[PDB]
Design an enzyme around this catalytic site. Sequence first.
Site, PDB file in Angstrom:
ATOM      1  N   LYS C  65       0.797  -1.235   0.000  1.00  0.00           N
ATOM      2  CA  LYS C  65       0.000   0.000   0.000  1.00  0.00           C
ATOM      3  C   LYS C  65       0.824   1.278   0.000  1.00  0.00           C
ATOM      4  O   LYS C  65       1.975   1.310   0.480  1.00  0.00           O
ATOM      5  CB  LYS C  65      -0.831   0.046   1.265  1.00  0.00           C
ATOM      6  CG  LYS C  65      -1.776  -1.091   1.433  1.00  0.00           C
ATOM      7  CD  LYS C  65      -2.571  -0.903   2.755  1.00  0.00           C
ATOM      8  CE  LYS C  65      -3.138  -2.195   3.244  1.00  0.00           C
ATOM      9  NZ  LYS C  65      -4.478  -2.393   2.679  1.00  0.00           N
ATOM     10  N   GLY C 137     -11.345  -2.788   9.727  1.00  0.00           N
ATOM     11  CA  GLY C 137     -11.205  -2.829  11.155  1.00  0.00           C
ATOM     12  C   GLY C 137     -12.393  -3.473  11.835  1.00  0.00           C
ATOM     13  O   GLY C 137     -12.186  -4.339  12.668  1.00  0.00           O
TER      14      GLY C 137
END
Lengths: 258, 258, 258, 258, 258, 258
Positions: C65, C137
């Site tokens: 990323k 998350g």
Amino acid sequence: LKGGVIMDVVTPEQAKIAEKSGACAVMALESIPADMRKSGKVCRMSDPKMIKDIMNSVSIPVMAKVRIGHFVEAQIIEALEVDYIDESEVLTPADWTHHIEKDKFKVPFVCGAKDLGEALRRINEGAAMIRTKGEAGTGDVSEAVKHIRRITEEIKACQQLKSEDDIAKVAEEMRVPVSLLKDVLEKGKLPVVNFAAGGVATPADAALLMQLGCDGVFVGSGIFKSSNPVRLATAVVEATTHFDNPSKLLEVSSDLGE
Amino acid sequence: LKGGVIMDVVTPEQAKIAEKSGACAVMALESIPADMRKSGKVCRMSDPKMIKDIMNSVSIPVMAKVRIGHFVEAQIIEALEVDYIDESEVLTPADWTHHIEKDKFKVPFVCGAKDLGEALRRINEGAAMIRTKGEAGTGDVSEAVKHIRRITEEIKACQQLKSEDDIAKVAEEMRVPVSLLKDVLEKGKLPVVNFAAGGVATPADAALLMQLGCDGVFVGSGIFKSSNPVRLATAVVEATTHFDNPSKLLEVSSDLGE
Amino acid sequence: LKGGVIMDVVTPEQAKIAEKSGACAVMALESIPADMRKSGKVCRMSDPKMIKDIMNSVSIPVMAKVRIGHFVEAQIIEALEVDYIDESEVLTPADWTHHIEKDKFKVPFVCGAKDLGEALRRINEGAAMIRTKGEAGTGDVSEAVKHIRRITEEIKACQQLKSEDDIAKVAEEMRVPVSLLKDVLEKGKLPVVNFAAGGVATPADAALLMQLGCDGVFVGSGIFKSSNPVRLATAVVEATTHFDNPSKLLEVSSDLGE
Amino acid sequence: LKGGVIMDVVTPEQAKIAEKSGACAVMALESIPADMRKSGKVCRMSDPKMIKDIMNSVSIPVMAKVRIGHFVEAQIIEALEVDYIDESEVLTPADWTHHIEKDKFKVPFVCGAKDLGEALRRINEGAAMIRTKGEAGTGDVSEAVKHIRRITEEIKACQQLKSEDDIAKVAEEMRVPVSLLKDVLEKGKLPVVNFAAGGVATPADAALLMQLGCDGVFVGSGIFKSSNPVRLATAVVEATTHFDNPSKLLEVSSDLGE
Amino acid sequence: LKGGVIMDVVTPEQAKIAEKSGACAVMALESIPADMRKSGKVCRMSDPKMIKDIMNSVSIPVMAKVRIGHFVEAQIIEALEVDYIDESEVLTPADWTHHIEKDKFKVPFVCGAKDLGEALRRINEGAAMIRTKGEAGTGDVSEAVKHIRRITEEIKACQQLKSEDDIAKVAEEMRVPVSLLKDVLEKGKLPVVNFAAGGVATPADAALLMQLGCDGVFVGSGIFKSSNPVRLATAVVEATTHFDNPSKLLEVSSDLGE
Amino acid sequence: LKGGVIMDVVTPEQAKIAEKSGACAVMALESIPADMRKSGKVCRMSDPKMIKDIMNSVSIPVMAKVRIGHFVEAQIIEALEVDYIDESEVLTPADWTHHIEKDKFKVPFVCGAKDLGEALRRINEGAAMIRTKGEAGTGDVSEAVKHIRRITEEIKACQQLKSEDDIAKVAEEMRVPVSLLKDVLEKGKLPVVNFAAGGVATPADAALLMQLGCDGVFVGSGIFKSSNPVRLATAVVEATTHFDNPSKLLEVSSDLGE
């Protein structure tokens, strides 16, 4: 029960103290909302066994509370043969839209009201007794006073309405039959006894509410939190009976403790 | 399942107790969504193994819950051969725009509804059973009462409607077919069983909801937090069954404990 | 570079596990970015050494990323010869106005999208792969479901437009060439693969997103917080492969534990 | 100082590390706002003695900060013979209405700007150097990027204004002389060097800002909080020098630590 | 008191130090209104005895504070023969609508002002000295700077006014006599000394306020919280005196400590 | 029943101190009502025994408080033969709509007022004495000053009205007979004595309120929290008497301590 005091009791022994103090009736209940209100819990009808145990301990009338709209609690309390059911805003309401249909019961009900419309709606549903909604728990007699003053003012204002047609518009806004409103105007009073309840902490408060025209007064567990419950309970009863005798209200208020 | 009680259970041994008590079904769930929701956790379908161990433990029907819109949880539950699937708003919704296409499954579903539109949308999608939404976990029966009463009232108020075109507009506002709303109005009621759920704490609560016209009631893990689960569970079953018999309601309500 | 499962990994050992479970790629990461946003912290490209150490440990493709707009991070990760670069909104964006000019790189890029416009703008900038955005998350699958459903529904509605001028007006509001929007409308789909990411916690979640039409599914470090990693990772891969087989979905979901 | 890195240093030894890493200059200061920002305290000019002690430790130029509008702090810093004064928004402003009149000083000043108008106002007051206002303390390079992009976009937009009269309206809204705005449009750049400052945490960030057209970059005490300040400082300098060499940005970013 | 420093002192020994340092006056106060104001306490005139012990300890002039509108505190302070009375907004105002009728006293007063109107109202009531309001206790010099600058600017902006009738309107909006505002505009400044106060922490701050045209400066208990009060107090005095001499300002600012 | 000082007392010993200090009356109180409002508590009439025990301990007049509207408390305190009854907003009001009908009692009443209308309404109901309301508890004198100034200023403005119809319109907004407002306008003052109460903490505060025209001053239990009670009580009495003598005000205010 007119001219009388009804006391909340949580045990048989408290009932016996209530009865020996002069109470006209007792109100059987497990808790006293409060401790539960500041906590969060649902307040419901008390266990029938603790109620019967109170009914077995005194020979004056015993009342008990059910939740607003909880007509099943009411059927259970009626079957228990209590003397009066108090459809009570102190407990956690069961139906926010519909009070209990009280005219389908044999046992008499008391309901609360903070104004004329509310009181007529409760009577029209079949309440046999009205009490002020007060402000329970706090010991502040001012909500009781507000509500009794408000009903009295509203009655008087209605009585100055000239048009039978305006009177009807009022019955309509209150959602009650015009005949019921008209009966109040002509008598200048509710057609049922009206007791003070909520915030009656001292003998003076009790005599105050009687001097404002209440037919009697309910007192809460505050009596039993005091350092001498017998002295305080007897003093509130005397004060309710001799509500217009200053020298006697003086005598019963002296040296009462905390 | 008409006239019955369905009980939430978190272990095989809880399920057995529900079955001895007279429950008509049990709902297997690994943990009530009233403990963790406080912690901020995603609540999903339970592990099929704990559902299977419950299913092996009783011979009455077993239900399980899946998230709203989670048609793959439902496929999995279906392959497990549970008896009913509860597409439940107590769980964390998987799809906030589409519920499951329930008419494409062969296991019956139950769905919540707080009003008519909602009930009819769930039925249109294939729900075989409706239940009120009420308030899970509070022990306050008033949300269940509000919803049953709202549905009943909306049916009555739609029954008053004179114009076929206005009926059609209502069906349109509901996003359901007119023929479904039309059939509700002709019959005066929902075309499937309707159960109360959320807030049903005492025998009196269960009988209240039945006298309001529910076909039965869900009760939650609260049975199993009481000092005597066997006694409370039995008492709720007897009250659901004898819901219109006060003396029986009195007897099961007396000496109920914590 | 088709479908399957891509797993976030923080060590060479996690990658090895990802590979032997059947993951089609890994996404090399030095931290789990939920831990750090909570802190307040800036999340950036991972240190090239740790990405390289992961590249060495498996023979399946490795992604990494970079922050949105951080084209120098992307220049560095490209020089490292990772297989895919993910321009990721989970990291702290470097440029809130300008995504990287991806058509200037030889390495292919994956980007996130929550709706049709966003997907077309990322493709227009040269993205080779789109992933739905999901809520990273939380383990809650509903944001991913929302975005997949949104894109689908917007394609279907743009498909209803009969006027070419109206189609052009849509392209222009999206800030993309009309020939790109026109291709999506004709084909009924994005011209690149579309994977679900964010909130894919259980085997059922993976298979849900595939049944909604995704071509694959990214899964987070949540796999590695679980009680048995190989087993959960293998179940997610199996469910992604057999997304359409209820009984296999049952088998891999059972007894998954924590 | 064009092509260069300026580092914040709090001790002579840090200055010596800055100088040996390649810094073109150092910025002497007591604290690093931050620890004080989250605390509450006024930030002021640093003690002249700690500044002279830094000036005595290196042979590169040394800068120091004064509060916005605090022209007395500036007179004291000039008399100390520092090389540049940074009229800094990091310190607690002394005059919220008037920046320092910088053209009345011999020593050159640097000022911050988040857009074109701000940058021209600072130059028109006599700033010799502009830096982005960044977002100091946080390590998030995105404010720096926003501000450099904004000045560049605004310059370009002004350059598309056809009417000399519209150009004047712009100078008026910016509160600067039209000649100054016109000089920017004709050169397509600010007439003074522009450095990135605020949020430059890594070598990649440094090379990023240079690739966006900055003439150099300031870095904060974050260099010295890292586990190897020499490696990190040398890596940011290399990255600033070789800002367009990916294989070298890769090499200097590898294995840097926390 | 032109060109001087007045220092807050809470003991005879503090007062002596102020006097050795070169202070032109001291302000006796029993406790800075920056400790208790936090606690929520009424701050009043100090005990005349502690004021008298300070007066006995030094031969320079002693000031004391009274609440706004508290003309009886002022009578008492006047009878004590202090040299100046500070009608202070740092104390808790006694009369939120009327300040003291100062022209009826024979001791000079000082009053705060944040702008022209305010200064002129205090002067009209008989103030012999004005001081800026700024921010007491923060050590932030910017409130003092804002107010001196606001007054200067309002004078300039009123000087631009062509119409005698408009000048008269301004005086009216101010609630002061035109002849007073007129005299301000003719002279270009307030007709009494104007001192800075609140926020003056460093020698540089004191010289800043003087170069802005203040006639002198108040400093608070902060002198006495520094490691070397004698050194700081002396340095502020020297900077107020040599307020336009950079080398001297440098020298007194160097090695100033905590 | 003219001017001087009335002191709140909680024991016979405090009253004895109040008397020997020169108080003109005492106000018997069982608690300090700042302590209790904080609690949340309802403050009511004091127990008659403790009032009586105070009545026995001094030969100067004794006052006691009752709640606003609590006419039965007032009936009791009257029977006790206290010298004045204070219908007091410091206690919890019993009737938020109706003050006591004081003209029906033989004992004189004191009431609070914050403006001219309120004072006239209390006098109209039969108050024999008005006190300004002040802020009780806080020791901050500014609310008392505000109310004294308000009443004065409203008299002065009603005095400007030239039309009798306008004067009548004022009386009617105040809800008082026009002959009562007319008498105040002619005489420039209330037809009964007006005392300051609430926030009179220091001798200077007492003398301030007298110079503002009050006829006397109530002081709270604050006297008895002080380091030396006799001395503070005597100073307040002396300042109330010599309200116009600066040097005596100085002498009694000096070395008052805590």
